[PDB]
Design a protein around this nucleic acid. Structure first.
Ligand SMILES: [K+]
Ligand SMILES: [K+]
Ligand SMILES: [K+]
Ligand SMILES: [K+]
Ligand SMILES: [K+]
Ligand SMILES: [K+]
Ligand SMILES: [K+]
Ligand SMILES: [K+]
Ligand SMILES: [K+]
Ligand SMILES: [Mg+2]
Ligand SMILES: [Mg+2]
Ligand SMILES: [Mg+2]
Ligand SMILES: [Mg+2]
Ligand SMILES: [Mg+2]
Ligand SMILES: [Mg+2]
Ligand SMILES: [Mg+2]
Ligand SMILES: [Mg+2]
Ligand SMILES: [Mg+2]
Lengths: 85, 63, 131, 274, 96
RNA sequence: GGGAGACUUGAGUGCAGAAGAGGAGAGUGGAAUUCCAUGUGUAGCGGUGAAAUGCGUAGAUAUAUGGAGGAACACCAGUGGCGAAGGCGGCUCUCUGGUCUGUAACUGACGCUGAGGCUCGAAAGCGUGGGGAGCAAACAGGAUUAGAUACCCUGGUAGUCCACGCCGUAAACGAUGAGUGCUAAGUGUUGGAGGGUUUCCGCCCUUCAGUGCUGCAGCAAACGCAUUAAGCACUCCGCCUGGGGA
């Protein structure tokens, strides 16, 4: 949902208007991943959507790797906030 | 000429039997867009509307 | 993605020369400027110019064609590649067509031709061959 | 679901059972429990009238309200419970007025569902209606043959019947066996199908389990003596050695129909099967 | 929320009082299942392009409604309309 | 190459839009076949190159009215669309993936490829449980033939359908890995965007991303490819080293 996306972006924005950034994108992707996980558990035969889920997971992993390479402190803070591993 | 564009209507109601009649032949078959002069988008919309009308009995399936 | 902008520049020049285009344009870089000026002063290309934009700048090359529209540049070859870098010691500096061509080389003295490199008695990385 | 035991012992090998996940409690209602003795297939004469029965585990009868004739108030499904007396599970439901009862557990039943009975009841799982009020195509169970007698047809685990149409004072029903027949329109039935759909897939695994389930060993006639069974006797293994296989009392076994040929219900049975 | 149009055909033989009661009942179902009925109106008594459940005429009635997609108003309307005898046929389509 | 910085073109996010048989779930609509039932009705119907088997006086075929049930979705329909591929075509609603076009607010190289791994993967096939109209391996009968374990005809089981789980193979083909940049044009078509007219429609220009055909340079053994390269270049992966044996 666009409203949920916007509220998440406001929550995780590094600064005013910070639509694009590791934190914002990773948080939005994590929420999308959770929702799509629920959708998949409902529809285990939705392989086509599951492929998009895997693409989202990969993109989020790449962003997390970039964030860790850039500022490890921000990486740790972000994973603590989002409850990731 | 594309009649739908000519009349300048972007919405195609499946209830408008008047409109849908000019896009089907006797026997109720759907006319090709190459024959009716209409474009691809309007052709698809007309197909959907005519099918829904057939289901609701506003247009005949055969004859 | 583009991994060898130098090779890309060489290929752009090669294709433009092949179709006998009057000019070509490329995204700018220091190494590209060095190569362009080397060609300019070696007479392989008629002229060079630069445009300042907000990305990296643009480098425009005016090709040189002789009488009867004969192509001055016969061809270009990328020697040192990202997959396999090529380095030559001072003695190993190559001669292109017994000197009728040139070999553009990057050295601690800068980017220079093979003639200059062996005159100075230094090696380097063989960027390209031109002839 | 069905859980398959690891082959720790040959007895346990290939055995499966039900996890009883759908079961919510193991405390039967004392008020609705009634005593039952194991007749072991013996009649008042004391003669074994039905073979292969006896022994096994003691059971208590749970009074099931097959009639579902309390239309006044709804009943809240309180528990889904195991019933030793029937393949399907039962459900303890409390009536708003304080009457507690058991019903057969339809597939999809959930604790807390508010079930209703009567002509005005909605067409939902667990509700009970006279057949005349059930729309065609509906899936039902617990169908009563005679009004007020209580459900008799479609009561085993996983069974279901389908309403096909109305005619006169009768409703056309396809029973679980595939037989299509007319049933009096005033008869009631429960919407849905009998739960515990997995019961059929259980692999018993060992003889002792059948003994627990009260089945005594069945002896093939071919290994008895001539005075014991028509198939008895003969040297070594022998074929049937007769015009047709027969029961111990001479009744043919394969293909011979036994339904009374002048049964009254034939008038109501539209299409037979089995 | 999302807007649906529900067009359904009432059997032609229905009495006027029965038709009114039926319309009110179904609109009430829609309202009670968390959907806002922005309009409901009898469209037309028309002849069917072919026989439906033995009828060749029918009363097309149109209900414009809105609701959240998750809301079960549309599902409940579909279920009860299929069960009902008065409604020969019905169709619910998303609109703009 | 390493470290400390800066930048926005690549990449992604934001904002505004477009189309779509993309996927899954649950329903639903008509044609038609078959069968069941009942009328009318009388001698064939069916089928082949010709025949016969077969069905039919126990009344068939046909025809009319109904009922049941399964499967696939005529017209639309189009080198049209979508998907990574396999593949996806009645209609409806729920969930859901991706793509593309604008804008330039945001991050500031975060990218490409990717052994080993994991996932999906036509048809057939396997297991459990359902379903089963038509079709149809096997099989049966009738023809043909020297023979006919076939082609042809009459029937017909598995299977074909569904749910779950295995199988992981196809001329799984564009017989052409992915990414990126450059190199004449001409002309269709799909979805956009902008402008110049046009009362709107529409017509003209430009442009983006697909899909086709024709055709320069170049390449090719030739066939042919040619901005959707099989041309000019760079990165990574897979794969080849005479035929058979295999
Ligand atoms: K065992
Ligand atoms: K039991
Ligand atoms: K035995
Ligand atoms: K014996
Ligand atoms: K109905
Ligand atoms: K979409
Ligand atoms: K199977
Ligand atoms: K084009
Ligand atoms: K050899
Ligand atoms: Mg027995
Ligand atoms: Mg003996
Ligand atoms: Mg005897
Ligand atoms: Mg004997
Ligand atoms: Mg013997
Ligand atoms: Mg298959
Ligand atoms: Mg055949
Ligand atoms: Mg292979
Ligand atoms: Mg194109």
């Amino acid at each position: 949902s666009q409203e949920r996306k916007n509220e998440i972006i406001k929550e995780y924005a590094r600064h005013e208007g910070d639509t694009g950034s590791p934190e914002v994108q990773i948080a939005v992707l994590t929420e999308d991943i959770n929702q799509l996980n629920e959708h998949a558990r409902t529809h285990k035969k939705d392989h086509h959507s599951y492929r998009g889920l895997m693409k989202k997971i990969g993109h989020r992993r790449n962003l997390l790797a970039y964030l860790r390479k850039t500022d490890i402190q921000r990486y740790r803070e972000l994973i603590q906030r989002l409850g990731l591993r | 000429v594309d009649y739908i564009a000519a009349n300048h209507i972007e919405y195609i109601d499946y209830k408008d039997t008047e409109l849908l009649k000019r896009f089907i032949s006797e026997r109720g078959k759907i006319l090709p867009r190459r024959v009716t002069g209409t474009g691809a988008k309007n052709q698809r919309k007309l197909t959907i509307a005519i099918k829904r009308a057939r289901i609701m009995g506003l247009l005949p399936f055969v004859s | 993605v583009m991994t060898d902008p130098i090779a890309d520049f060489l290929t752009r020049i090669r294709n433009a020369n092949m179709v006998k285009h009057e000019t070509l344009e490329v995204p700018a870089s220091k190494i590209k400027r060095d190569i362009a000026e080397i060609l300019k002063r070696e007479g392989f290309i008629r002229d060079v110019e630069y445009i300042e934009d907000d990305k990296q700048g643009v480098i425009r090359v005016f090709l040189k064609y002789g009488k009867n529209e004969e192509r001055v540049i016969t061809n270009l070859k990328r020697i040192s590649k990202p997959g396999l870098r090529a380095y030559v010691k001072a003695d190993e500096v190559p001669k292109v067509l017994n000197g009728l061509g040139i070999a553009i080389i990057s050295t601690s003295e800068g980017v220079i031709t093979d003639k200059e490199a062996r005159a100075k008695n230094i090696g380097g990385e063989v960027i390209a061959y031109v002839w | 679901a069905i859980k398959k035991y690891k082959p720790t012992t040959n007895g346990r090998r290939n055995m499966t059972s039900s996890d009883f996940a759908e079961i919510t409690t193991s405390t039967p209602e004392k008020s609705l429990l009634q005593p039952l003795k194991n007749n072991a297939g013996r009649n008042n004469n004391g003669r074994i009238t039905v073979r292969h029965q006896g022994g096994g585990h003691k059971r208590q009868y749970r009074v099931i309200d097959f009639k579902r004739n309390k239309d006044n108030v709804a009943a809240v499904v309180k528990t889904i419970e195991y019933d030793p007396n029937r393949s399907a599970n039962i459900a303890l439901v409390h009536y708003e007025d304080g009457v507690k009862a058991y019903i057969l557990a339809p597939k999809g039943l959930e604790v807390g569902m508010r079930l209703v009975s009567g002509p005005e009841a909605d067409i939902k799982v667990g509700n009970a209606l006279p057949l005349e009020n059930i729309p065609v195509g509906t899936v039902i169970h617990n169908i009563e043959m005679k009004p007020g007698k209580g459900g008799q047809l479609i009561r085993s685990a996983g069974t279901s019947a389908q309403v096909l149409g109305k005619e006169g004072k009768y409703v056309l029903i396809r029973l679980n066996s595939g037989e299509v027949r007319m049933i009096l329109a005033t008869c009631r039935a429960t919407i849905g199908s009998v739960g515990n759909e997995q019961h059929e897939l259980i692999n018993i695994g060992k003889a002792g389990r059948s003994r627990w389930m009260r089945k005594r060993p069945t002896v093939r006639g071919s290994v008895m003596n001539p005075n014991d069974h028509p198939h008895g006797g003969g040297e070594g293994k022998t074929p049937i050695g007769r015009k047709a296989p027969v029961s111990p009392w001479g009744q043919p076994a394969i293909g011979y129909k036994t339904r009374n040929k002048k049964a009254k219900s034939d008038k109501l049975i539209v299409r037979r099967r089995t | 929320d999302t807007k649906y149009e529900i067009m359904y055909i009432i059997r032609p033989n229905i009495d006027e009082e029965a038709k009114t009661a039926l319309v009110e009942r179904f609109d009430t179902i829609l309202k009670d299942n968390g959907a806002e009925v922005i309009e409901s109106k009898d469209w037309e008594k028309r002849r069917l392009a072919y026989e439906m459940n033995g009828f060749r005429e029918g009363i097309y009635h149109i209900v414009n409604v809105t609701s959240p997609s998750t809301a079960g108003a549309i599902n409940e309307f579909d279920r009860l309309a299929k069960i009902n005898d008065d409604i020969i046929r019905h169709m619910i389509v998303k609109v703009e």
